[PDB]
Design an enzyme around this catalytic site. Sequence first.
Site, mmCIF file in Angstrom:
data_model
loop_
_atom_site.group_PDB
_atom_site.id
_atom_site.type_symbol
_atom_site.label_atom_id
_atom_site.label_comp_id
_atom_site.label_asym_id
_atom_site.label_seq_id
_atom_site.Cartn_x
_atom_site.Cartn_y
_atom_site.Cartn_z
ATOM 1 C CG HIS A 189 -17.014 -14.265 10.290
ATOM 2 N ND1 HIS A 189 -18.110 -13.948 11.063
ATOM 3 C CD2 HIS A 189 -17.133 -15.585 9.999
ATOM 4 C CE1 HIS A 189 -18.871 -15.022 11.215
ATOM 5 N NE2 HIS A 189 -18.296 -16.031 10.587
ATOM 6 N N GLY B 200 -26.462 -16.637 13.825
ATOM 7 C CA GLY B 200 -25.993 -16.682 15.194
ATOM 8 C C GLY B 200 -25.257 -17.955 15.563
ATOM 9 C CB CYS C 217 -20.604 -17.974 13.197
ATOM 10 S SG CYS C 217 -21.409 -17.749 11.601
#
Lengths: 306, 306
Positions: free
Chosen positions: A41, A143, A145
């Site tokens: 993503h 932030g 991920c």
Amino acid sequence: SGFRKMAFPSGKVEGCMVQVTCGTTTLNGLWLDDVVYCPRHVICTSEDMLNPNYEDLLIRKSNHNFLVQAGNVQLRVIGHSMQNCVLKLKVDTANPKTPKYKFVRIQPGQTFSVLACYNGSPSGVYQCAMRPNFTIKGSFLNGSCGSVGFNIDYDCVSFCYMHHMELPTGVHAGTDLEGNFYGPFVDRQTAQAAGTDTTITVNVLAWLYAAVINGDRWFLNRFTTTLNDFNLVAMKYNYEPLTQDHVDILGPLSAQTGIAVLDMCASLKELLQNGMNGRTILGSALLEDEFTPFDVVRQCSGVTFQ
Amino acid sequence: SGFRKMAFPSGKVEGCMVQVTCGTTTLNGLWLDDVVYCPRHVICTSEDMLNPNYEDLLIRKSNHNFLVQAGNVQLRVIGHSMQNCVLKLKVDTANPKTPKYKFVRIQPGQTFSVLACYNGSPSGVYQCAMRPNFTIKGSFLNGSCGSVGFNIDYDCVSFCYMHHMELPTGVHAGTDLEGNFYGPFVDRQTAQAAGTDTTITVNVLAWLYAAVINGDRWFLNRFTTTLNDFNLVAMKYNYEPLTQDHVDILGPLSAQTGIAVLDMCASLKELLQNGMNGRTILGSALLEDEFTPFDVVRQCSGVTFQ
Ligand SMILES: CNCc1ccc(-c2cccs2)cc1
Ligand SMILES: CNCc1ccc(-c2cccs2)cc1
Ligand code: NA
């Protein structure tokens, strides 16, 4: 003595954490050998978060669209590919700090350490369990991920989780390192709900065994139970069914303490009925379900004591 | 979202752990620059421990009696001396992995990360607080002595604890890195016990603010109190006194959440006087006191340590 939620030392994983930037989006990547793994993503744009076509988004990217920073060093991307929901960025440098490692997909009830990271740098380390509903109860801010979960049982790092998203209830969802989600979730912004969560019964029993190993027996009783009667009771408290596999798994702790597994089941049944009556077990006023049988054996003495 | 008990990333400390053997005894050392630090009790037999004369025991030893391994590599000891209750073994090689570091002595109520080690090999990491009674509720087995506790203050590892002993109640005692014990303890086999402990009030308040920040607000109320009034309640419930400095330290959290400290003290008063009424706060049925105001702000902001 003592009993703590203990993570693995994080250094072997710290040496692999990088920052991946695509467009205006920055998250964390995992650098092993010459590959950087991160959530796919990272390539999404703002008006296309609900139903992105990752194949169509990725084909439009060139290697130089991915900015990968390791410490103060920019790494050069020389190739890219998508595997399920992870992006694999091939880079022109092997990570010299790559540990002995493997990728393992875990089952609900398993625990692992999470190295929370932002902008490629580690923030802290803590223990999580894969819940029966395939979520984890983490501490993740915007932030985070691409932060990963892992075990390091015998000098080899087993990577088991990469963080992708937070569900509306505040719990967390992600993938293994092959990019397959845990649970029925998808990397789309459309609202998703996790199944009702339940308590990890086998882990509660292991933790009761830990309490006995560390010298506390107050919660035991003179009774026993059949496996089926235990499950009929425990399910009324939203506990997961206990299987014969779990009973077998608890064999070693039963042998160490002299308390038959089904006897410890009777103790649990009574605790669910009575509560703790102002007492604590290993410093907790609730029944703890995020220690596995393996965790207890690794942390506790092999000699039932105190 | 989420709030978890979280340790600092341990990698910088892992590179400093070594194995120290003297006679039949093996424990851990901390290798920084060209010195290895470990508990002075390593030089004692089991008869010596009844009434050790440490200087006399040390003169009988010479450098070659201290076998030091960094991984699979021997380190040559070239000098030895004692500072308070720590032995300082001069070695022929400075540790190339020595991080930016300082030795700091912490105050009761301060938290720190423990890197539990055995045979010089890091095994786990967890978060501790120095209790008001100067013990720590650690998790340590035989062989763990010399394991260290630390914080990371921006770019610098602040070493604050070295593990020496377990007390009869299963809690733990040790020294700063200058070998001064925390608490009224001695490194001699004599009768010793943890004093009655109290709860760290400022940390409970910090954790209540963390709860509110994470959407857990049921315990808030319309009332406020005074320091003198609240301190009467704290004393009654074996909580540490709350000082104006504690109030000032919690100022940021008061401004962020709109709940003044004495307003939150009114909540804490009511919780102490009435219990939790079957509810939990941040998943706990107990009032958690091992998060400092700084820990709450840090985790709630994603501060990082590359
Ligand atoms: C091998 N030397 C490691 C080391 C380097 C710098 C410092 C500090 C510089 C300023 C404040 S602490 C401390 C230790
Ligand atoms: C190799 N030396 C063995 C040893 C000696 C003394 C002690 C302590 C006595 C009291 C607090 S620690 C522990 C271990
Ligand atoms: Na109030």
